[PDB]
Amino acid sequence: MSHEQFRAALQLVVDPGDPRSYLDNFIKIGEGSTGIVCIATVRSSGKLVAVKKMDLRKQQRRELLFNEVVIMRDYQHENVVEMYNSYLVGDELWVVMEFLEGGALTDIVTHTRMNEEQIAAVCLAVLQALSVLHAQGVIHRDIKSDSILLTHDGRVKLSDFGFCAQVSKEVPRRKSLVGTPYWMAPELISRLPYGPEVDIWSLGIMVIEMVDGEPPYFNEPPLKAMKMIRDNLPPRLKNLHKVSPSLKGFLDRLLVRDPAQRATAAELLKHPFLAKAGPPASIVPLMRQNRT
């Protein structure tokens, strides 16, 4: 797919018109894997939203970007970040999405230690989203703390579907090497046909993040960690004894090398560990703006 076929295809699935017609005061707040993030205001209502501006000339696999807009444009789930509109502006894809005040889980796991009630709440939210997604044949493929956002009141939402893929009866598996090194499933690194189960492994790594503050082999270069993940026995927790038997049991069902033996999102939703989940209000204290 050439650059022009890409822009054209993109132009075909994005909203027509210029967002500058109803969006004001754009203000950069950060950036991502291939662009920047800004906050803006909807003219008519004064409602604040977040805008993801992506550089089309920096997309490694531009097919994946197309998949993100097509598959998730109208997606609606309480634990999934909502996309309002998308626009093709020159050589940039602008995606207008909801603004989540709580930030990403990354900032939390790297500056504080969550209790088990907070961890269960996060796992539960992510698992509710994945169970619905997986049932529809949608695989996220980039589960990690960075992909998890929080609302001001503590609700958990899955975002960053930039690496997502679709499977079906006709095409039950994918083989693309995608995701983030430290969180990649061993079967995916091995380049073996894989399915939704890879999200479950990545989630397990995110659990290690919540307990330890970082994923396994985080002290190793990405390509080296990938080799270790693919060839070594499942990773272990540094703060092993600081977690309960319930959390350890839960984790053991996530980090199973053989995907056929790994638990599924649906099965995990009934695991005793998630019964400890606290309400959204328990997540609030974790946010940077509220941490001491």
Ligand SMILES: CN1CCN(C(=O)N2Cc3c(n[nH]c3NC(=O)c3cccc(Oc4ccccc4)c3)C2(C)C)[C@@H](Cc2ccccc2)C1
């Ligand atoms: C690694 N990814 C995380 C998700 N991002 C998003 O796509 N975001 C972030 C975001 C959104 N809505 N509301 C927020 N809130 C904050 O970002 C948000 C809110 C409050 C606090 C905060 O952190 C902070 C943490 C420490 C210090 C200061 C701030 C972040 C959307 C547009 C969905 C990705 C962007 C992207 C991807 C690809 C290409 C270009 C851009 C990057």
